[PDB]
Amino acid sequence: TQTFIPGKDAALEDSIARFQQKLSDLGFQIEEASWLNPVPNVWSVHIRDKECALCFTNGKGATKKAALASALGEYFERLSTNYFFADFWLGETIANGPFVHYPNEKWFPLTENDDVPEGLLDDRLRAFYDPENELTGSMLIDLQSGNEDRGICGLPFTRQSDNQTVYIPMNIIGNLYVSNGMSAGNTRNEARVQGLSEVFERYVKNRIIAESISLPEIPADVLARYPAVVEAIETLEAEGFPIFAYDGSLGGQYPVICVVLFNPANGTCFASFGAHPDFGVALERTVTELLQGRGLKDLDVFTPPTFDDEEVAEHTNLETHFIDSSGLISWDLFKQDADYPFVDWNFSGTTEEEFATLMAIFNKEDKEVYIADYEHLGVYACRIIVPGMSDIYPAEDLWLANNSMGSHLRETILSLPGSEWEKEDYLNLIEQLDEEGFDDFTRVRELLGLATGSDNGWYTLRIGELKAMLALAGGDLEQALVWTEWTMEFNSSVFSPERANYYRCLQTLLLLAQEEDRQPLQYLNAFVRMYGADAVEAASAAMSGEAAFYGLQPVDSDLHAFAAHQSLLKAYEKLQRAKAAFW
Amino acid sequence: TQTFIPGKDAALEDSIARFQQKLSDLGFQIEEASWLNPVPNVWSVHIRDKECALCFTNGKGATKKAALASALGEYFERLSTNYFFADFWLGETIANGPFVHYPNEKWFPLTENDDVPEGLLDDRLRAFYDPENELTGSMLIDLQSGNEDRGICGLPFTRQSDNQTVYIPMNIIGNLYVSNGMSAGNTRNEARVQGLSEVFERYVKNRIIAESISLPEIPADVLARYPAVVEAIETLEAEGFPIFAYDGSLGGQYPVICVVLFNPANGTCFASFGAHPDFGVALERTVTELLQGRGLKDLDVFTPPTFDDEEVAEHTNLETHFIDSSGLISWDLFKQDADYPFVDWNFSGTTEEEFATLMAIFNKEDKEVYIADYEHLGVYACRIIVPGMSDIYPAEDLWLANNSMGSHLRETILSLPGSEWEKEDYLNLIEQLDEEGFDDFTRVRELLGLATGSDNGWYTLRIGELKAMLALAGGDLEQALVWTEWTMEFNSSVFSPERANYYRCLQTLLLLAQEEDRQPLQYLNAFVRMYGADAVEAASAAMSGEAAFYGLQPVDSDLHAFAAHQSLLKAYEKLQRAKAAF
Numbered sequence A: 001t002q003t004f005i006p007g008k009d010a011a012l013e014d015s016i017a018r019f020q021q022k023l024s025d026l027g028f029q030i031e032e033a034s035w036l037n038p039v040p041n042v043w044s045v046h047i048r049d050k051e052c053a054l055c056f057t058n059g060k061g062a063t064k065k066a067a068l069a070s071a072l073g074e075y076f077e078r079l080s081t082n083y084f085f086a087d088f089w090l091g092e093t094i095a096n097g098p099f100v101h102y103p104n105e106k107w108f109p110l111t112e113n114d115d116v117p118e119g120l121l122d123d124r125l126r127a128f129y130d131p132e133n134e135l136t137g138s139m140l141i142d143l144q145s146g147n148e149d150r151g152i153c154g155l156p157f158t159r160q161s162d163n164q165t166v167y168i169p170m171n172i173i174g175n176l177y178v179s180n181g182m183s184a185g186n187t188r189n190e191a192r193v194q195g196l197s198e199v200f201e202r203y204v205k206n207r208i209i210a211e212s213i214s215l216p217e218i219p220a221d222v223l224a225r226y227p228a229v230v231e232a233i234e235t236l237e238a239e240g241f242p243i244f245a246y247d248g249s250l251g252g253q254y255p256v257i258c259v260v261l262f263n264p265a266n267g268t269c270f271a272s273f274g275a276h277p278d279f280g281v282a283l284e285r286t287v288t289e290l291l292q293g294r295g296l297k298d299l300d301v302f303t304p305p306t307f308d309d310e311e312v313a314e315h316t317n318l319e320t321h322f323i324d325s326s327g328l329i330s331w332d333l334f335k336q337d338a339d340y341p342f343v344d345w346n347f348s349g350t351t352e353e354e355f356a357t358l359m360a361i362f363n364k365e366d367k368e369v370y371i372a373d374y375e376h377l378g379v380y381a382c383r384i385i386v387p388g389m390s391d392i393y394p395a396e397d398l399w400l401a402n403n404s405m406g407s408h409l410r411e412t413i414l415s416l417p418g419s420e421w422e423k424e425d426y427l428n429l430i431e432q433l434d435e436e437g438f439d440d441f442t443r444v445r446e447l448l449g450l451a452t453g454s455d456n457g458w459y460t461l462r463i464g465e466l467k468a469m470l471a472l473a474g475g476d477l478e479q480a481l482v483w484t485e486w487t488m489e490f491n492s493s494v495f496s497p498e499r500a501n502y503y504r505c506l507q508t509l510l511l512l513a514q515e516e517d518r519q520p521l522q523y524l525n526a527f528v529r530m531y532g533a534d535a536v537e538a539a540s541a542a543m544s545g546e547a548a549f550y551g552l553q554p555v556d557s558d559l560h561a562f563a564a565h566q567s568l569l570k571a572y573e574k575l576q577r578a579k580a581a582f583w
Numbered sequence B: 001t002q003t004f005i006p007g008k009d010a011a012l013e014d015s016i017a018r019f020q021q022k023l024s025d026l027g028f029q030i031e032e033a034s035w036l037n038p039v040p041n042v043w044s045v046h047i048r049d050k051e052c053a054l055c056f057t058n059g060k061g062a063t064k065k066a067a068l069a070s071a072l073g074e075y076f077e078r079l080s081t082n083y084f085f086a087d088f089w090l091g092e093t094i095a096n097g098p099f100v101h102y103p104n105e106k107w108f109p110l111t112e113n114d115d116v117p118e119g120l121l122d123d124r125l126r127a128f129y130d131p132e133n134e135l136t137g138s139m140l141i142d143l144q145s146g147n148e149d150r151g152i153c154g155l156p157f158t159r160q161s162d163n164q165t166v167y168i169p170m171n172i173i174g175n176l177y178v179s180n181g182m183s184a185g186n187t188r189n190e191a192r193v194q195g196l197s198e199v200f201e202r203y204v205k206n207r208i209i210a211e212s213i214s215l216p217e218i219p220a221d222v223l224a225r226y227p228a229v230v231e232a233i234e235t236l237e238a239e240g241f242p243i244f245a246y247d248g249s250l251g252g253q254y255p256v257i258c259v260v261l262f263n264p265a266n267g268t269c270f271a272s273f274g275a276h277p278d279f280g281v282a283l284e285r286t287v288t289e290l291l292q293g294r295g296l297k298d299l300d301v302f303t304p305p306t307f308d309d310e311e312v313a314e315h316t317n318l319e320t321h322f323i324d325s326s327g328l329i330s331w332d333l334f335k336q337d338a339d340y341p342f343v344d345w346n347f348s349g350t351t352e353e354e355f356a357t358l359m360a361i362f363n364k365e366d367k368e369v370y371i372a373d374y375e376h377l378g379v380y381a382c383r384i385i386v387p388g389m390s391d392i393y394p395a396e397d398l399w400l401a402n403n404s405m406g407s408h409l410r411e412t413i414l415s416l417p418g419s420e421w422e423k424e425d426y427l428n429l430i431e432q433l434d435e436e437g438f439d440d441f442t443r444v445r446e447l448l449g450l451a452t453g454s455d456n457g458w459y460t461l462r463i464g465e466l467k468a469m470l471a472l473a474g475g476d477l478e479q480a481l482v483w484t485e486w487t488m489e490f491n492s493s494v495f496s497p498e499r500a501n502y503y504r505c506l507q508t509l510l511l512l513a514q515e516e517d518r519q520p521l522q523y524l525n526a527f528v529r530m531y532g533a534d535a536v537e538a539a540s541a542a543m544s545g546e547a548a549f550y551g552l553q554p555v556d557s558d559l560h561a562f563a564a565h566q567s568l569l570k571a572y573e574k575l576q577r578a579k580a581a582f
């Protein structure tokens, strides 16, 4: 059986078999973990690496096959772009090895005035990321390596207008574009059309949301051309979820559809977006995205619409929409009168024509397009950057919210368990954290790029809690109390029972230490009965300054102490081998 | 079969059969709803009136029979004292009828200077409740009648020192003593001993908690005398709950035990208290109270101990402990060194001797004891007041937290649905509520004494929400918005889905009304698809001022609009008949 769906350059069954066989060849054991089919003609599936819990993707589509091909395609997309590893430091060995990201990557050493080395970027890119000329080189060290001595790692992208290779720092790519504009496919142009369409989806989505645009409805006689989608919608409506199907082309300019679901049970809406040169493919994607990974009982996590236009335009609201679509939407979307008339648009053709048709729209926007091609995993994948259209985070984040900002503290923080510094050093580090302006809520593991696993204290450790630990090690019991209370107020819910119990104990002991007229020995039996001897022992050891870093095991520079991180590195090595062999 | 337990003047099976037969004779159909036996020698049971959801009690004891006799006894205690009705207005007919509470009640009309009429209370009681002489008569109108014209309803109690009848206003009783010191029993003295012991329990409990007293442990060789209790405690400890068994006699003065449970899973404690002249009976009650209505998975609702002395002593903390025992306990309770030595105390004997022994302790405290006797339901019951010992709430509450404080607004508020006042009258009522200083969080149904039932908007209506409704009826859409947001912030969780939906709709419309550059008709179709046509219609009708009191049905003066309240009155009429006949 061979099923050819609109817009794909191969049959579903062929894609599936091919992708499955290649994953296996590369040494990946991928399992399908759960399947959903919540309404007619809407499927989703979750797939994951049996040997690495951090690596998974999700599929979506109008049939079970289409969803599986989608999951597997996304798997190749994320593998090819190293995206599963993007939020992690990959250790000292990988950092100093032949190549960190790709064999054709280029390292640009830091300059003495700490300017951005000349061979990176190009003029338009410099003007777009750094209109102030305030970028330094040392801010652009990639999270994965953390290797300041080796310098700024740049990845090669082909500038489409003149076919020139341009090196864009991993740091800029990782922070500003994340997973937007990546793609994999049966062919080069199928993949590229999907990636370019994704750029349109998110860019136009952001305009629609941020500008509180009222969109025009897709007339019923147009929807009737796509009965599989009409069935899905009718079912949703029968199940108590009103659906609004909108043309998001903004007057026929962009190949974008918007579909909005209401949940009357809680007064909320959920706006989904999709793009493709073919109107029906775009419409379908939008609906299948809506329900991805959601049954009809999982539609309860969204937000009511609002009249507050400023809050809807806030870039953080657009970021939230990217992360989980639970951002704010203006009531103006659902106005009777649309700000653009409906257009029954069509940009469809062969995958070759579609690529040229979409590039013509970027050319007309006067927006340069940069494409990196990847074929080292035996499937075509790409990553497309369009500065000023495909960005997910604003360029100011390179200064304000850079994911490699805490690299320079990694070695120090990982050395704390078993450290034997002078008290003042521990207290000084508290001040350094404050002066460097880290949010107390930041997860240390995210700040340092650690796949800690779930069964130790690093998993849940936030800056605030670290400050508690440093206060204890440093002998400042008043600061210890402040940050121990903070810790419990904002984390007790996610601690294991053992760790929560330790913290109740420790807090009780710290409160007692502030009771000048009370004798600790009078309470000891009661403390032992409430908290257990072990916790009373550990907590007292923390208060003496002897073992303040409770539940934090020592961590080496290749993260051997974290089984989860080891599983991540083993997954990476599979990719490293593939890269070495392809280049 | 006949089972006699320590301290009771009749066999469990005799009490059970007797109490069951009498309830049936009086017209009450009582069912046993749920039974628990969470550890050995600890039982509890919940019983309720099949025809009135608001009437139920709970039993506890060391055996199933003992727990059933306890439930039924408590049933007679609460029926005899009218306590099931204590938080409700009983309507116009009852208010104006031959008698509201008892045939031997006395009504004292209000005076011209609004002093407290002379025949009420006695000199000591006046000095205790009103040391500054600031009590007025009009503040002592009983919640049940609300009948200011008829005056202050006083109930007769017998002062024990000289056997004189003294009339204590229902209002003072209801606000300050609640259910503390009531009792029923197989005999007059068995009941009275239980009631006096309860006064000791709660008075000593409050001292122990409020003063952060470290109590002494009951030595193991004493506990061994009561193996049924020891088995219960060992089981609890094996199940992961450390138990502290303390002597709470404060140096042998009072017949009180304290038992504390720790829940290490939570870091919390739960202190229980119990009293009786027999040390073993007191100990057992304390443990059986601990687990009443709780399985081993229901020990998760308590609070950690604290070092904050002031917060523990706060009277609101002691009130909380009375209401659900979830108040704060000082860590000092669990200190190694006790503030009193253990005393292996014993005040036991016959119920007659026990009554005299306990009265001797009150005589020594120089605390007068007042006792009302009730036998109109065919079972002896009593209610005992010991001013300065049995009080649950402080006398200042007669001024600051009086449960009849909102009676004068009842007629007005109940008339609001379907009312057709001028806008300004609605807004004026908002100001009146503010100026009278009612908390926005107060439930209107509690303020007015309404058994609303759970299926209408009166059930969940708080002052803040009433202000939203008045703002709408009065045409003030800015105030309407403020209080509509307050309403959802603090009540949406307990609204029915239909009511919550109505409030999301209304709030959306009130926000839209503040948007000067937006046209409402542009959003209508979206509003109908989100909220339904009915809610859009009801919310707009509220915003026009035409039907602002959404989900509040009109209420007549006999509360016919509330089925639940009708079921309450029918239960009360069964008691009225019994009273008249006795």
Ligand SMILES: Nc1ncnc2c1ncn2[C@@H]1O[C@H](COP(=O)(O)O)[C@@H](O)[C@H]1O
Pocket: A008, A012, A015, A058, A059, A060, A066, A069, A070, A071, A072, A073, A074, A075, A077, A182, A183, A184, A185, A186, A190, A191, A194, A195
């Ligand atoms: N039938 C297919 N054959 C090959 N690749 C696919 C197919 N469907 C989706 N993909 C790729 O899988 C990823 C996720 O697909 P989607 O879930 O449709 O956004 C993207 O890289 C797609 O371009």
Ligand SMILES: Nc1ncnc2c1ncn2[C@@H]1O[C@H](COP(=O)(O)O)[C@@H](O)[C@H]1O
Pocket: B008, B011, B012, B015, B058, B059, B060, B066, B069, B070, B071, B072, B073, B074, B077, B182, B183, B184, B185, B186, B190, B191, B194, B195
């Ligand atoms: N056999 C009995 N057992 C327990 N309580 C009884 C009995 N006969 C009457 N009572 C009364 O039952 C009510 C509640 O009992 P308790 O649950 O022990 O506090 C109190 O008013 C007791 O005085």
Ligand SMILES: [Mg+2]
Pocket: A058, A074
């Ligand atoms: Mg996807």
Ligand SMILES: [Mg+2]
Pocket: A182, A198
């Ligand atoms: Mg994608």
Ligand SMILES: [Mg+2]
Pocket: A214, A215, A216, A217, A332, A333, A334, A335, A336, A337, A338
């Ligand atoms: Mg519209």
Ligand SMILES: [Mg+2]
Pocket: B058, B074
């Ligand atoms: Mg009870």
Ligand SMILES: [Mg+2]
Pocket: B182, B198
């Ligand atoms: Mg009682």
Ligand SMILES: [Mg+2]
Pocket: B214, B215, B216, B217, B332, B333, B334, B335, B336, B337, B338
């Ligand atoms: Mg003690």
